[PDB]
């Protein structure tokens, strides 16, 4: 989607806010928000691509200035409702309850070793998105290609600043989960992945840095051959 979140190239966002140093988690709620990721993932709320799509659908004004982990909470609620695993009305009632009683206890519950096992496995084992497909790569290093000008209304990794632009294939990484289907609940439908190089002049015109290039990863359907 052509969401505001697709900020590459956007002007007027202001100076970078960078403290000399900061904690990993600025508040306890951030720790919770962070841990909810593997929790909802394991529960089938969503996959990584859908997770991102949920954030992309946020109110732009809220996205641009809210604390980062709040975006995660929004997507959890988004998919919780989508899958019917979260009752919005009940969530609202409990939110008010905790507003009025911030120190009220959490629900009694049993700890689960399987959840710790999941955490350790996912963290140190990872969640590889690489996949094998039956088709060979359509492109190769050196090929000159043009990025699609398609504008899907659903999830995709097509930064507006590279659409319609021409670049050179730098490397073929093999096949990976395709966002355009995965982020929209349409499955992995793996596609070959390539890193493509675009000169700053190509991307920004005369305002671009004369000695700079941007490398952007493109799934096969995103690009078409210009010159072999």
């Amino acid at each position: 989607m052509n969401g505001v979140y697709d900020v590459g190239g956007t002007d007027g966002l202001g100076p970078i806010n960078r403290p000399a140093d900061e904690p990993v988690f600025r508040a306890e709620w951030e720790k919770v928000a962070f841990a909810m990721f593997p929790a909802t993932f394991r529960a089938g709320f969503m996959g990584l691509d859908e997770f991102r799509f949920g954030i992309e659908q946020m109110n732009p004004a809220e996205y641009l200035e809210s604390p980062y982990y709040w975006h995660w909470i929004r997507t959890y609620i988004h998919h919780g409702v989508r899958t019917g695993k979260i009752d919005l009305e009940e969530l609202e009632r409990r939110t008010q309850y905790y507003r009025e009683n911030p120190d009220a206890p959490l629900p009694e519950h049993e700890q689960k070793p399987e959840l710790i096992e999941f955490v350790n496995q996912a963290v140190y084992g990872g969640l590889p998105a690489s996949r094998e497909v039956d088709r060979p790569p359509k492109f190769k290093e050196g090929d000159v290609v043009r990025f699609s000008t398609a504008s899907p209304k659903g999830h995709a990794r097509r930064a507006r600043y590279v659409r319609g632009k021409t670049g050179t294939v730098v490397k073929h990484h093999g096949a990976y989960i395709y966002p355009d289907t995965a982020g929209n609940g349409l499955g992995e439908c793996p596609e070959h992945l390539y890193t493509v190089r675009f000169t700053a002049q190509e991307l920004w015109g005369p305002e671009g840095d004369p000695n700079s290039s941007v490398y952007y990863d493109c799934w096969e359907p995103y690009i078409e051959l210009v010159d072999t």
Binding site: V119, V123, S130, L193, S212, D217
Partner: protein
């Protein structure tokens, strides 16, 4: 930036806290979230996974030409040689800074970052300001924000990680460090040097 419509940071934090505790209470009742799971995840990224891991890779590459070749050939496999890898670092491609080229990494579409070698990203890396400007005015941003002046003649390659491939910068080894031990060299490798917004520490 100023926004006359925005509540105070205090009110914002109070509201978020309530919303998160409410959602948490529900996920807990569903049996998919527990306090131990929360504590374990936090523990890992507050004390176990951090940029010191990436620093170990860097110093090995600085002192082992062959390892360096392997690192640049296949980042994931190479880092596994040191027991480094995992979540959000399943696919890593390291890029080497030289006298002719400088690399800088960004995730304009979200906030993707190589957790296994750098840990969780600092907030500025995930925010709109850095993400929007670095692919458009990388040279000026590095100078203005990080006091890092990259000569006009030196090419700046900006890596926008739009896929699951994670890009990590192998900074140039600072001069005056001949024969230094890996432990001594590590003191010069910073999280910033591996993102490309700053070179490794001088002297």
């Amino acid at each position: 930036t100023e926004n006359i419509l925005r509540k105070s940071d205090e009110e914002i934090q109070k509201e978020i806290t309530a919303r998160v505790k409410a959602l948490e209470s529900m996920l807990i009742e569903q049996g998919i979230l527990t306090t131990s799971m929360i504590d374990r995840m936090a523990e890992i990224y507050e004390n176990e996974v951090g940029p010191h891991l990436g620093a170990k890779v860097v110093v090995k590459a600085w002192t082992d030409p062959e390892f360096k070749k392997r690192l640049l050939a296949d980042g994931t496999e190479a880092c596994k040689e040191l027991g480094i890898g995992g979540l959000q670092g399943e696919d890593m491609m390291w890029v080497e800074n030289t006298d002719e080229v400088h690399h800088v990494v960004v995730c304009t579409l979200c906030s993707c970052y190589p957790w296994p070698v750098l840990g969780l990203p600092p907030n500025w890396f995930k925010e709109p300001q850095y993400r929007s400007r670095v692919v458009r005015e990388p040279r000026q941003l590095l100078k203005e924000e990080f006091g890092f002046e990259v000569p006009p003649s030196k090419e700046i390659k900006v890596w926008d990680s739009s896929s699951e491939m994670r890009f990590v910068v192998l900074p140039q080894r600072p001069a005056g460090t001949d024969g230094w031990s890996e432990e001594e060299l590590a003191t010069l490798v910073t999280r910033e040097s591996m993102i490309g917004v700053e070179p490794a520490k001088a002297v």
